[PDB]
């Protein structure tokens with residue numbers, strides 16, 4: 001595997017987005033990795049609609065701004081036969097009525113998704129080498145919420161509550177890290193991104209390695 005991977009150097013990461021007060025992080029994470037794999041196999045980076053997942057993708061315990069699961073975001077794109085763009089179905093940070101004309105207008109498709117073996121940072125590094133991967137972490141603490149710069153080491157638990165996207169990894173000064181794309185605008189962290197301690201064992205720092213998944217497009 002490479003010593004460093006950064007999907008932003010390959011044109012596979014859309015600029016930082018802002019979810020606001022709506023609890024739609026599951027939709028932001030699912031969309032960022034579908035944007036990623038679409039660029040890798042089709043060669044064109046298109047920004048996609050989180051709002052379509054929030055409005056049209058309600059199922060079981062995925063309930064729009066009320067929270068949900070990354071994999072239900074991928075399963076909506078699979079069952080719908082595709083997803084529309086951010087410009088065609090823009091984000092309102094609201095639970096809204098599914099716009100059926102916009103739901104039927106599809107520009108990007110995926111075929112299936114896979115789960116990375118949980119609590120296995122080596123298998124997670126292998127998957128990130130091929131594409132951005134969706135993860136969730138424990139973002140309930142003030143240290144996480146107030147993060148500004150550096151390689152974050154904690155404190156944080158592992159009972160995850162906030163989905164984000166890993167867009168790379170590297171090492172600086174002998175310290176290994178993951179590069180994380182968050183959805184709290186460019187005013188949080190390193191212009192919207194976080195570097196977080198890698199190779200710590202088990203579930204990873206703030207549980208980042210405990211439930212990774214990614215979309216598959218043949």
Ligand SMILES: *[C@@H](C(=O)O)[C@H](O)C(=O)N[C@@H](CC(C)C)C(=O)NCCCCNC(N)=[NH2+]
Pocket residue numbers: 019022023024025026061062063066067068069070136160161162163
């Ligand atoms: C994350 C955010 O917007 O900050 C958002 O709260 C969220 O969806 N969190 C997920 C985190 C991982 C995907 C596990 C979460 O905790 N989902 C569980 C939501 C259950 C909702 N069920 C009901 N009944 N509202």
